[PDB]
């Protein structure tokens, strides 16, 4: 679990744009207001190789 990738973003990266932000992502009807829930998800995932 040392290896991770971003699952969703507000917009696609420009060439060689780098994004280390941890902010919770609105994945549907729920406005996030700085906390997780249904339709509001953590932006990274881990491979579990």
């Amino acid at each position: 679990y040392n290896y991770l990738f971003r699952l969703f973003r507000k917009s696609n990266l420009k060439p060689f744009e780098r994004d280390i932000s941890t902010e919770i992502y609105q994945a549907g009807s729920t406005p996030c207001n700085g906390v997780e829930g249904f339709n509001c998800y953590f932006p990274l995932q881990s491979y579990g190789f």
């Binding site: 060689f16 744009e17 780098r18 902010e23």
Partner: protein, 107 residues
């Protein structure tokens, strides 16, 4: 004596700080914290080191590289930008990798 560039400029995201220490240009990218109006009183993910007058600069960011051009001259007119022509020449082309939306100038 310096400039700051970034999206939030401070706090929750990375930003680019340029400062002249009166001996070197000092440059860093970090999750910087600062006041609403900082002064140069007497994670470092990128770090680097290197009226009578008019100093001119151009700043642009493309494909994660940040370009700086400049020119310096004495001037005759005391008020503002004299009506005339000369061209700015490149200083640096820094591989900073961030996006930018805001900037601020440091006295």
């Amino acid at each position: 004596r310096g400039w700051i560039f970034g999206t939030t400029l401070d706090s929750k995201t990375q930003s680019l700080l340029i400062v002249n220490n009166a001996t070197n240009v000092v440059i860093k990218v970090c999750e910087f914290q600062f006041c609403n109006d900082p002064f140069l009183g007497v994670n470092c993910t990128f770090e680097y080191v290197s009226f009578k007058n008019l100093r001119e600069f151009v700043f642009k960011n493309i494909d994660g590289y940040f370009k700086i051009y400049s020119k310096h001259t004495p001037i005759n007119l005391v008020r503002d930008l004299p009506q005339g022509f000369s061209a700015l020449e490149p200083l640096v082309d820094l591989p900073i990798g961030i996006n930018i939306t805001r900037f601020q100038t440091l006295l």
